């Protein structure tokens, strides 16, 4: 399933709003929630929120 799943950031993604999650190429986020579409919900040391699935590496491909 999806519980505390580590995901490595693919590309730099600037979070615009409060519930958006900023991503840095090279870093890793903790994925908890993953929807049926491109909006996933994970925590990046400091804040939690929504990030695009196309911008994260679950583990490989």
Swiss-Prot record:
Domain of life from the UniProt record: Eukaryota
Transmembrane regions listed in the UniProt entry: none
Post-translational modification: Phosphorylated on Ser and Tyr residues. Phosphorylated in response to activation of EGFR and FcERI. Phosphorylated by activated PDGFRB.
Effect on the protein of changing residue 39 to K: No effect on RASA1-binding. Almost complete loss of RASA1-binding
Domain SH3: 3-61
Stretches of the chain forming a coiled coil according to its record: none
Locations listed in the record: Cytoplasm; Endoplasmic reticulum; Nucleus
Signal peptide range: none
Subunit structure comment from the entry: Interacts (via SH2 domain and SH3 domain 2) with EGFR. Interacts with PAK1 and SOS1. Interacts (via SH3 domains) with PKN2. Associates with BLNK, PLCG1, VAV1 and NCK1 in a B-cell antigen receptor-dependent fashion. Interacts with SOCS7. This interaction is required for nuclear import. Part of a complex containing PPP1R15B, PP1 and NCK1. Interacts with RALGPS1. Interacts with CAV2 (tyrosine phosphorylated form). Interacts with ADAM15. Interacts with FASLG. Directly interacts with RASA1. Interacts with isoform 4 of MINK1. Interacts with FLT1 (tyrosine phosphorylated).
Record text about domains: Only the first and third SH3 domains seem to be involved in RASA1-binding; the second SH3 domain and the SH2 domains do not seem to be involved.
Biological role: Adapter protein which associates with tyrosine-phosphorylated growth factor receptors, such as KDR and PDGFRB, or their cellular substrates. Maintains low levels of EIF2S1 phosphorylation by promoting its dephosphorylation by PP1. Plays a role in the DNA damage response, not in the detection of the damage by ATM/ATR, but for efficient activation of downstream effectors, such as that of CHEK2. Plays a role in ELK1-dependent transcriptional activation in response to activated Ras signaling. Modulates the activation of EIF2AK2/PKR by dsRNA.
Stated name of the protein: SH2/SH3 adapter protein NCK1
Naturally occurring in which organism (per UniProt): Homo sapiens (Human)
Residues represented out of the complete protein: 107 to 165 of 377
